């Protein structure tokens, strides 16, 4: 919307690029805001559609997550990097509301920029947003609903299906609902002296393309992706109480410390010194084999020298794997991870307490890839999910689709209070802020009234991607929510409305409780706070100064 550029003044000189001041900066900030905003508008909602990005090498990326889309977009505009890093902050902390916080913060900048031309001061505009946000948080606490009179896991099953919507797994969300709920409950641990916490990424995601996505098997235990060192080793271990050895010590021919220079005056010493180099490693592996360990995990590669004794003893060898993956194996099976093998005494020894316990250790071949399936852990339970699709690019989307579903359920069990989703909160916060600021009024009434209509961008965008009539659905959301705000908590009726609306599939107003769509209260909070700081930082900038690179 900027034409004629700007006239360079000779009385004003600075090294590097020219300095632009006035309304042109805020006009370019909104122009750069709407550029990244229009990308995530079509990807929001179950009726939304994602976009494709080419890497110039021929490979592409198909994902519905707004964080990955903005991460692949490198913005040269200084204020444009705020919304890019906002999505990376959203999924890292809460894990949900990534597309919404970008669209909410975009409408906050579009309406506030129109208010700056109204001559109201930006700090007064910012004050109106912060005062309205303080009361909006208090309204969120009033609409909280604690799960009660629910049968089994249906509470977590219905909430998990909300994050599965808008993504390729939305059609299969009925089958995938039981896999996500049971995955985070198996990794359940205890910390902070009684506080329940869950690990992130602990559930392994394996990519094997074949069969169908609905046939994906849920392994009652951890699965590790690795290839066997020697093909002569057994791929299946029969019998219970399988001992797993988690070790960071590789078995290889190793050079002595660089600070040592061997000088020998006799040729006869060349036989014993060369033999002892391999003999030192034998002392560590000999005590492990005698302990009866069936599976030996190793962080680093193992030469064929020590792989001979594993075949005779029927011990399965393992080579380089991720360091963070071997930690949860020892914790689940009861083994203790050993970075360097040593004892309190000056003599080397091996204790049976360092060996894990499980029901069985098997290696299953999915397509042409081979992975180990560890089922029936002893000390702590675990889980893994093997995603199946038509091509590897669909599996890349299902990984972020599964990772986003794990973050929503994680925040669900931390706070029992939940709020209805599907544009119900955004429609409820509009009317609550309409009656608000009418008492104070004065100049701040205009800035607060625009903040209420700024949250209307979320429910209106959902109806556009559905190829339906938006004005018909928006007028209904304003009809049920407005009249019920003044209700008195007796004679019932009344507030029984306003708790539901905006169903994109059938285009009708239906109850979200019977539908099952819900959202955790953690995803709603901190989303407007992060969107506010992104709006305040950009709005306060009168002049942008660019320095040419050296």
């Amino acid at each position: 919307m900027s034409q004629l550029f700007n006239n360079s003044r000779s009385d004003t000189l600075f090294l590097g690029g020219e300095k632009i001041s006035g309304d042109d900066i805020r006009n370019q900030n909104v122009l750069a805001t709407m550029a990244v905003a229009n990308v995530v508008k079509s990807s929001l909602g179950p009726v939304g559609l994602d976009k494709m990005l080419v890497d110039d090498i021929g490979d592409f990326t198909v994902t519905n997550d707004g964080a990955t889309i903005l991460s692949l977009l490198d913005v040269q505009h200084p204020a444009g990097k705020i919304l890019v890093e906002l999505a990376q902050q959203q999924d890292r902390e809460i894990g949900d509301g990534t597309t919404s916080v970008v669209i909410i913060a975009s409408e906050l900048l579009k309406r506030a920029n129109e208010l700056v031309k109204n001559k109201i001061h930006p700090t007064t505009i910012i004050t109106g947003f912060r005062v309205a946000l303080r009361e909006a948080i208090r309204f969120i606490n009033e609409v909280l609903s604690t799960s009660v009179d629910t049968l089994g896991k249906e509470t977590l099953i219905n909430i998990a299906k909300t994050s599965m919507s808008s993504k390729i797994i939305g059609a299969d969300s009925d089958f995938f609902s039981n896999m996500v709920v049971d995955a985070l409950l198996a990794v359940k641990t205890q910390n902070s002296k009684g506080e329940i916490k869950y690990p992130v990424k602990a559930v392994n995601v394996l990519k094997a393309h074949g069969k169908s996505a609905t046939e994906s098997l849920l392994v009652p235990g951890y699965a590790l992706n690795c290839t066997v060192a020697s093909q002569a080793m057994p791929k299946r271990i029969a019998g219970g109480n399988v001992k797993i050895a988690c070790l960071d010590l590789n078995l290889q021919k190793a050079r002595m410390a660089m600070g040592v220079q061997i000088n020998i005056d006799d040729p006869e010493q060349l036989e014993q010194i060369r033999k002892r180099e391999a003999g030192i490693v034998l002392e560590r592996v000999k005590k492990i084999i005698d302990a009866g360990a069936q599976v030996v995990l190793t962080t680093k590669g193992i030469d064929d020298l020590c792989l001979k004794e594993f075949v005779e003893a029927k011990i399965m060898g393992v080579r380089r794997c991720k360091k963070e993956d071997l930690r949860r194996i020892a914790r689940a099976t009861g083994a203790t991870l050993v970075s360097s093998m040593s004892n309190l005494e000056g003599e080397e020894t091996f204790e049976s307490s360092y060996l894990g316990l499980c029901d069985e250790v098997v290696q299953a071949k999915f397509s042409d890839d081979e992975c180990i399936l560890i089922k029936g852990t002893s000390k702590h339970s675990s889980s893994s999910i093997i995603l199946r699709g038509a091509n590897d690019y669909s599996l890349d989307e299902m990984e972020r689709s599964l990772h986003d579903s794990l973050s929503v359920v994680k925040r669900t069990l931390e706070s029992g209070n939940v709020v209805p989703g599907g544009g119900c909160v955004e429609a409820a916060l509009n009317i609550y802020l309409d009656n608000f600021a009418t008492t104070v009024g004065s100049r701040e009434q205009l800035a607060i009234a625009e903040f209420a209509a700024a949250l209307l961008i979320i429910p209106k965008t959902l109806a556009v991607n559905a190829a339906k009539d938006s004005s018909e659905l928006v007028a209904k959301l304003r009809s049920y929510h407005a009249a019920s705000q003044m209700a008195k908590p007796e004679d019932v009726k009344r507030r029984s409305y306003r708790n539901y609306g905006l169903d994109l599939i059938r285009g009708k107003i239906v109850d979200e409780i019977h539908a099952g769509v819900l959202e955790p209260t953690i995803s709603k909070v901190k989303s407007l706070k992060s969107a506010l700081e992104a709006c305040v930082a950009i709005l306060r900038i009168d002049t942008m100064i660019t320095v040419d690179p050296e």
Binding site: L73, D304, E312
Partner: protein, 520 residues
């Protein structure tokens, strides 16, 4: 400007139209590659070689296609190959037609893609039940039944003339690798090829075929009962991880250094002679000094061997790989070796190791092939991988699906009947699936030279009344039944064709906009 973006942004309905048109062109090239009369496609690689095959897997692999949507069709080729290996051409043709036939709308009806996707998920579930009902189980222990089953993929290839000989090679190769459930893998199947010769003279021989002649002239090239021992360590003198750096004060110490190097290697040779092996195989290089003391005891020396061949040798003779010479024992020595011989061929030498054939570890075997040239060998090798993969599905899944396009047409009839009973808004996406299923048997008519209008009209009428085995004849282009046609195909091949094609179509329907060249 802003970031990396814009240029020409394709938005609206034309972005999905470009995805349908580009993906449709993928199946149009291999459209003539389906059926027994299918032609061949010659490919030109940047390396300077030549690839001539009718298999859509190898055709779409070497061809470089630059397009966001069209590359997703290229990835579907390895989906059918790695999971099964048969039907790669059928999946691409089916998935290419589904996107065009099931979603011409949104150009006209303006139906939302997810609404169509919800109907595709219900159509995939009903399509699996129809295949299960038309599938008749077959005995896996019948040798005569497995021969006609392997010829299914052979009928569309060039080896159909040798199909009587080809089924003998594929049946013995899968049965040998099969280990007792009955899990087999092609990593132990050897693809090694012999240039020249007669195809009828090619036979599957147990053991590992080595290209290396014996090292010494006095090494026996004929042994009645060879005893094989595998050594990973080289017979040469190991320098060690750290430098020795001998300081020699007196002139007599230097000669002892070179004298021990002869005795140290001799010490490793004396430990080998304890088990008196007839054939010694070393993974790494061997010194000319170590071969003498091994020849005195009767041991045989060979050239360095790759790691891939060491695993196949241990399975045939039952030997165990022994790295440490001091730990070598008689229990790890391979036995039950039928014959050891070396035949002369102008290109290279060839060493034969025969198995005594008489539960334990799975046996390994190599497939010898005599072609007319080097490129003909690569074509039959791809034909064997497609033919031997058929025997892997019947063993794991005894169910047997109808072939000759009868599977896809049987589903199209059932989808049309339930389309009127379902009604609703999903009737159009659900009924459009049946139109994409009948395109595969329609291709058989176009390649045969018949009239698809009159043949497909009588095929649908005779399908309900006559039987579910009615299909299109490849050679005569007539209406025949698969019962008297004598050729059938496993259900796993048909299940992978329906699942992969539908699951891939749902990915392309969700595309909104396309931006190219963002960054690396």
């Amino acid at each position: 400007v802003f970031m990396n973006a814009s240029q020409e942004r394709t938005t609206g309905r034309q972005a999905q139209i470009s995805n349908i048109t580009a993906a449709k062109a993928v199946a149009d090239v291999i459209r003539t590659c389906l059926g027994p009369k299918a032609m061949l496609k010659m490919l030109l690689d940047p390396m300077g070689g030549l690839v001539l095959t009718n298999d859509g897997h190898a055709i779409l692999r070497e061809i470089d296609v630059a397009h966001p949507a069209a590359k997703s069709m290229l990835e579907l080729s390895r989906t059918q190959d790695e999971e099964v290996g048969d039907g790669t051409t059928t999946v691409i043709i089916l998935a290419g037609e589904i996107l065009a036939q099931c979603a011409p709308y949104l150009i006209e009806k303006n139906i939302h893609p997810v609404i169509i996707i919800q109907a595709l998920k219900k159509a995939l579930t009903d399509a699996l039940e129809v295949i299960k009902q038309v599938s008749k189980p077959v005995d896996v222990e019948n040798d005569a039944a497995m021969k006609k089953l392997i010829q299914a993929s052979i009928g569309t290839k060039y080896v159909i003339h040798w199909s009587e000989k080809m089924c003998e090679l594929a049946l013995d190769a899968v049965k040998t690798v099969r280990k007792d459930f009955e899990i087999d893998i092609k990593r132990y199947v050897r693809v090694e090829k012999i240039p020249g010769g007669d195809v009828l003279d090619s036979r599957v021989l147990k053991g590992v075929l080595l290209n290396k002649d014996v090292v010494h002239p006095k090494m026996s090239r004929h042994i009645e009962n060879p005893r094989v021992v595998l050594l990973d360590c080289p017979l040469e003198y190991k320098k060690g991880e750290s430098q020795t750096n001998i300081e020699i004060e007196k002139e007599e110490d230097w000669n002892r250094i070179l004298q021990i190097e002869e005795e140290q290697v001799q010490l490793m040779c004396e430990q080998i002679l304890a088990v008196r092996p007839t054939l010694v195989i070393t993974e790494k290089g061997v010194s000319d000094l170590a071969q003498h003391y091994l020849l005195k005891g009767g041991c045989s020396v060979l050239r360095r061997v790759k790691k891939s061949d060491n695993n196949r040798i241990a399975r045939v003779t039952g030997a165990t790989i022994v790295n440490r010479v001091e730990d070598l024992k008689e229990s790890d020595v391979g036995t039950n070796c039928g014959l050891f011989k070396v035949e002369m061929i102008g290109d290279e030498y060839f060493s034969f190791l025969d198995n005594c054939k008489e539960s334990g570890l799975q046996k390994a075997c190599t497939i010898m092939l005599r072609g007319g040239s080097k490129d003909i060998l690569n074509e039959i090798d791809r034909n064997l991988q497609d033919a031997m993969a058929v025997a892997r599905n019947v063993m794991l899944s005894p169910s047997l699906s109808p072939g000759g396009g009868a599977t896809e047409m049987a589903v199209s009839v059932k989808l049309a009947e339930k389309a009127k009973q379902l009604e609703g808004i999903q009737q159009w996406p659900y009924q459009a699936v049946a139109d994409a299923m009948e395109c595969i048997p329609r291709t058989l008519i176009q390649n045969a030279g018949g009239d698809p209008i009159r043949l497909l009209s009588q095929l649908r009428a005779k399908h309900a009344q006559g039987n579910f085995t009615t299909g299109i004849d490849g050679d005569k282009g007539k209406i025949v039944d698969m019962v008297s046609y004598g050729i059938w195909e496993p259900e796993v091949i048909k299940q992978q064709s329906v699942k992969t094609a539908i699951e891939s179509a749902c990915l392309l329907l969700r595309v909104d906009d396309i931006v190219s060249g963002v960054r690396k």
